[PDB]
């Protein structure tokens, strides 16, 4: 009929300012179009489509955006790759993430799902057309998903299957909890564990909805990699390791909770396997709005920080969109 | 026969209002955004309004906002454009025009409608 | 508002011949660009949609391309009833403007 699934370049908008020092300014300054003040969206009457977060390339452009916007962007001075090196110019430059609209071309149109509690797989109901999607500040992290949107209405499961036990799963949050993280003038970070703590009773509520009533227990990241173990985030252009093991408490108690973080400059990169060294009053303030999990005897489930695929930061942001082309006839 | 014929010629006085139709044949009416231009003889063609037709959604150009109102009936398959308090500069060819749906896109025509305003 | 304009307001070509004429738009579209073309009396065709789409009736004749603020629109094997005024829209934003316009004539 009129439309169909698509698969085609996305151009991105930006509120930026081309004279910015902020760094993301300079990927967006002559890549990004101006957003656009007068948008549209248009109801789509009795129509119905399904809509699958786990498979749509939106995801894909963004990801190679994000390495473009990393590789040119705070280049690291020696990547090793080990096999062969490459020590390059590796200049300080300014460093925050500031959102970015994805848009059809021409001849296409991004659907949108308007079923707020819409989980990421199957049939939505209130069905959109849009010309860009909203803003998306693209940070790259684990375990927790910071400056993200919110679940405009209750706290959502994300997951391809909940019998499947590989597959990751982002809780979607309903309202945001703090997070300072700061290099005191080798780090720490701190919340307020009161209501974090409320927040996260909540979540253990609505995952015994998914597990039938059962015993939700927290528990450490088994091993592997310092950047799945621990909250790992680049804040204004420096690395954090924050060690989460206190967040999970299955203890709770509710005063602020600090956090032990470390600050690398030798890191494990996302853009590609390998290993990257960068050179050399720094804090980050940040709402996090959703969390990554994996399921792990008795009737209890244990849960663990996962992340690591950054391809799952983007699906968090984009599983209401669909891109379609706009078949004309008559 | 895919086609959209318009209303008669019309001639007002400054101060008054207009109201044109446009009857479609050929097309599945269902899935169009009906959109509506004017020309002033010898000046741009511009872009007045839109209505999505399975929505009934619509929206203007600052330009008409507050004097233009844009509708249709799904019965006959027929759009409606009303023009209130006319001025002089309100002269020119109005045609309503077919289209996909999204925020504007590509358009078939129907054949123009003369009204004029003038004291 | 993003003001489109055409070039040239007026050209002469003759029969058989190959032309180009050129829009370009202020606040750079990025590929959200129609040509329609006009005679006197009647009301617009649709020539070309996107930038590079053309109309399944139209001949394959006219031809179409741009970037994000230059776009061009070519005829070549320029037939009789070619000879018209040709306006390029925008789609994206504010009002959907369209171009100044610009007319052929018998290069004869």
């Known amino acids: 009929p009129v439309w169909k699934d698509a698969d085609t370049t996305l151009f991105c908008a930006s509120d930026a300012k081309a004279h910015e020092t902020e760094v993301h300014n300079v990927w967006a300054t002559h890549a990004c179009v101006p957003t656009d003040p007068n948008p549209q969206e248009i109801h789509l009457e009795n129509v119905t489509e399904n809509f699958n977060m786990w498979k749509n390339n939106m995801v894909e452009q963004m990801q190679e955006d994000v390495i473009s916007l990393w590789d040119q962007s705070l280049q690291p001075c020696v990547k090793l790759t080990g096999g062969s090196v490459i020590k390059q110019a590796c200049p300080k430059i300014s460093f925050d993430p500031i959102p970015i609209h994805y848009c059809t071309p021409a001849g296409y149109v991004i659907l949108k799902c308007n079923d707020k509690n819409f989980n990421g797989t199957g049939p939505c109901k209130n069905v959109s057309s849009v010309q860009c999607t909203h803003g998306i500040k693209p940070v790259v992290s684990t375990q927790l998903l910071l400056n993200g949107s919110l679940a405009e209405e209750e706290i959502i499961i994300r997951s391809e299957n909940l019998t499947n036990n590989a597959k990751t799963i982002i809780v979607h949050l309903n309202k945001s909890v703090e997070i300072n993280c700061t290099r005191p003038s080798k780090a720490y970070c701190e919340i307020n564990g009161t209501k974090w703590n409320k927040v996260l009773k909540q979540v253990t509520e609505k995952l015994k909805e998914h597990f039938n009533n059962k015993t939700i227990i927290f528990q450490p990241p088994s091993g592997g990699d310092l950047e799945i173990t621990m909250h790992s985030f680049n804040c204004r252009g420096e690395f954090f390791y924050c060690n989460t093991t206190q967040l999970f408490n299955n203890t709770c108690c509710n005063g602020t909770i600090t956090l032990p973080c470390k600050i690398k400059q030798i890191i494990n990169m996302w853009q590609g396997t390998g290993q990257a060294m960068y050179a050399p009053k720094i804090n980050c303030v940040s709402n996090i709005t959703g969390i990554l999990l994996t399921r792990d005897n008795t009737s209890n489930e244990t849960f663990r920080p996962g992340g690591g695929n950054i391809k799952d930061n983007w699906r968090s942001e984009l599983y209401k969109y669909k891109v379609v082309q706009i078949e004309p006839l008559g | 026969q895919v086609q959209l014929v318009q209303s008669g010629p019309e001639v007002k006085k400054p101060g008054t209002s207009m109201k044109i139709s446009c009857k479609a044949s050929?097309?599945?009416?269902?899935?169009?955004?009906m959109q509506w231009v004017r020309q002033a003889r010898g000046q741009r063609l511009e872009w007045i309004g839109w209505?999505?037709?399975?929505?009934?959604?619509?929206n203007y150009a600052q330009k008409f906002q507050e004097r233009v109102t844009i509708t249709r009936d799904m019965s006959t398959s027929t759009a409606y454009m009303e023009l209130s308090s006319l001025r002089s500069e309100d002269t020119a060819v109005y045609y309503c025009?077919?289209?996909?749906?999204?925020?504007?896109?590509?358009?078939?025509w129907g054949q123009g409608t003369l009204v004029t305003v003038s004291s | 508002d993003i003001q489109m304009t055409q070039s040239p307001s007026s050209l002469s070509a003759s029969v058989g011949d190959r032309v180009t004429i050129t829009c370009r738009a202020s606040?750079?579209?990025?590929?959200?660009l129609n040509w329609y073309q006009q005679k006197p009396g009647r009301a617009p065709k649709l020539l070309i949609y996107?930038?590079?789409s053309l109309l399944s009736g139209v001949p394959s004749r006219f031809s179409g391309s741009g970037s994000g603020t230059d776009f061009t629109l070519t005829i070549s094997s320029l037939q009789p009833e070619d000879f018209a005024t040709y306006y390029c829209?925008?789609?994206?934003?504010?009002?959907?403007?369209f171009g100044q316009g610009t007319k052929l004539e018998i290069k004869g």
């Open positions: 025009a077919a289209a996909p749906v999204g925020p504007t896109s590509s358009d078939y």
């Open positions: 050929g097309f599945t009416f269902t899935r169009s955004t």
């Open positions: 209505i999505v037709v399975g929505s009934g959604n619509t």
């Open positions: 606040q750079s579209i990025i590929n959200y």
């Open positions: 996107a930038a590079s």
């Open positions: 829209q925008q789609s994206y934003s504010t009002p959907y403007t």
